[PDB]
Amino acid sequence: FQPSPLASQFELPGDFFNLTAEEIKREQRLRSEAVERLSVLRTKAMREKEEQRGL
Amino acid sequence: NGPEIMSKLAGESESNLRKAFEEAEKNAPAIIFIDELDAIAPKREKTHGEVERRIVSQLLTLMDGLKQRAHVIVMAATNRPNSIDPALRRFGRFDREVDIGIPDATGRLEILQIHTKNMKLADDVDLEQVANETHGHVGADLAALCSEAALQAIRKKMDLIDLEDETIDAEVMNSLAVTMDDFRWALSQSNPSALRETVVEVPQVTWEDIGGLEDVKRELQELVQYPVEHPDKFLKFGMTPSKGVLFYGPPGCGKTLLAKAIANECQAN
Numbered sequence: 358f359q360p361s362p363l364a365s366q367f368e369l370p371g372d373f374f375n376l377t378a379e380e381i382k383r384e385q386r387l388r389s390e391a392v393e394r395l396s397v398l399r400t401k402a403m404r405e406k407e408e409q410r411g412l
Numbered sequence: 413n414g415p416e417i418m419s420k421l422a423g424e425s426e427s428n429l430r431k432a433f434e435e436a437e438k439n440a441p442a443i444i445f446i447d448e449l450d451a452i453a454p455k456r457e458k459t460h461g462e463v464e465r466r467i468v469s470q471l472l473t474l475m476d477g478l479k480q481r482a483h484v485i486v487m488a489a490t491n492r493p494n495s496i497d498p499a500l501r502r503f504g505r506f507d508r509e510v511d512i513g514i515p516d517a518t519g520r521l522e523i524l525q526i527h528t529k530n531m532k533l534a535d536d537v538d539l540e541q542v543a544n545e546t547h548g549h550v551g552a553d554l555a556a557l558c559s560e561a562a563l564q565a566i567r568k569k570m571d572l573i574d575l576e577d578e579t580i581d582a583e584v585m586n587s588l589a590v591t592m593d594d595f596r597w598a599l600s601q602s603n604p605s606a607l608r609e610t611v612v613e614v615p616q617v618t619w620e621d622i623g624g625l626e627d628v629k630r631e632l633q634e635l636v637q638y639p640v641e642h643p644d645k646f647l648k649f650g651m652t653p654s655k656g657v658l659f660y661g662p663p664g665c666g667k668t669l670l671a672k673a674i675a676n677e678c679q680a681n
């Protein structure tokens with residue numbers, strides 16, 4: 358294949374960097390869930406059931 | 413408020429306290445409210461400072477001056493009725509007090525209803541369920557729940573319609589309703605500010621909630637209601653009503669329901 362220098366020339370919309378209510382609430386929910394997951398008292402079997410989902 | 417007066421230099425704290433009383437007389441009828449009373453007038457035997465002992469003396473004399481300052485009532489708030497210098501509670505001065513405590517389940521629902529007067533609620537919103545779940549919450553926390561649930565509904569819908577400005581069309585505002593998911597979200601974010609303190613309330617337990625013990629339920633009514641429902645018979649026969657009863661036996665048999673059930677029927681705390 359031959360790359361074309363023109364593929365790297367693109368200008369973003371001005372509103373690109375303005376995050377929505379769903380994007381901001383999603384991140385804050387994940388922050389609360391991440392702290393909760395670190396606090397959870399669970400056995401190795403429950404830990405593996407989640408980790409194994411990516412294999 | 414205590415801490416603001418105490419933040420002043422010696423002489424400034426006393427002058428500022430006196431001014432408030434002089435202004436109240438000029439503007440009578442007037443009410444002077446002193447917040448954090450234990451901070452402005454802590455127990456003298458519990459401190460070392462001369463200024464703190466002096467400001468207590470200044471408040472004590474200003475309270476006594478209320479016999480001359482017509483139509484002026486002084487109110488104060490503290491966290492604990494026994495955390496203030498006892499002199500303030502002597503005859504005259506602060507001769508009345510009222511225990512506000514913590515709202516009960518009914519009051520918590522009332523607070524949620526008050527802080528939703530203007531809010532459009534969806535059919536799935538159930539504030540009674542919230543009031544029962546919000547154990548340990550006070551009005552400051554329930555107000556936060558209402559405002560936070562409103563914001564979540566506003567950000568989901570209105571923030572995708574309106575500009576970042578101070579003026580919104582009335583129709584857009586009226587089209588925004590708050591769902592139960594927004595109240596549940598706020599509930600998970602809020603944390604009760606008064607969870608450890610004991611809450612006193614009229615219980616909702618009734619006699620129909622207790623299985624068995626039919627004779628005990630009646631006996632409590634005789635012990636608690638009869639002395640005031642039929643006082644002429646107790647006087648006629650020279651009977652001295654009992655002041656209380658002790659229960660004993662295995663745990664988990666309904667002892668808590670027995671005391672609550674009679675309190676419920678009697679509408680007592």
Ligand SMILES: Nc1ncnc2c1ncn2[C@@H]1O[C@H](COP(=O)(O)OP(=O)(O)O)[C@@H](O)[C@H]1O
Pocket residue numbers: 621622623624662663664665666667668669
């Ligand atoms: N006689 C009963 N009838 C109905 N429910 C009961 C009875 N006894 C106990 N319970 C249930 O058991 C729970 C615990 O009762 P309680 O009197 O608080 O036990 P404890 O001895 O631990 O105080 C109550 O919430 C009540 O619902």
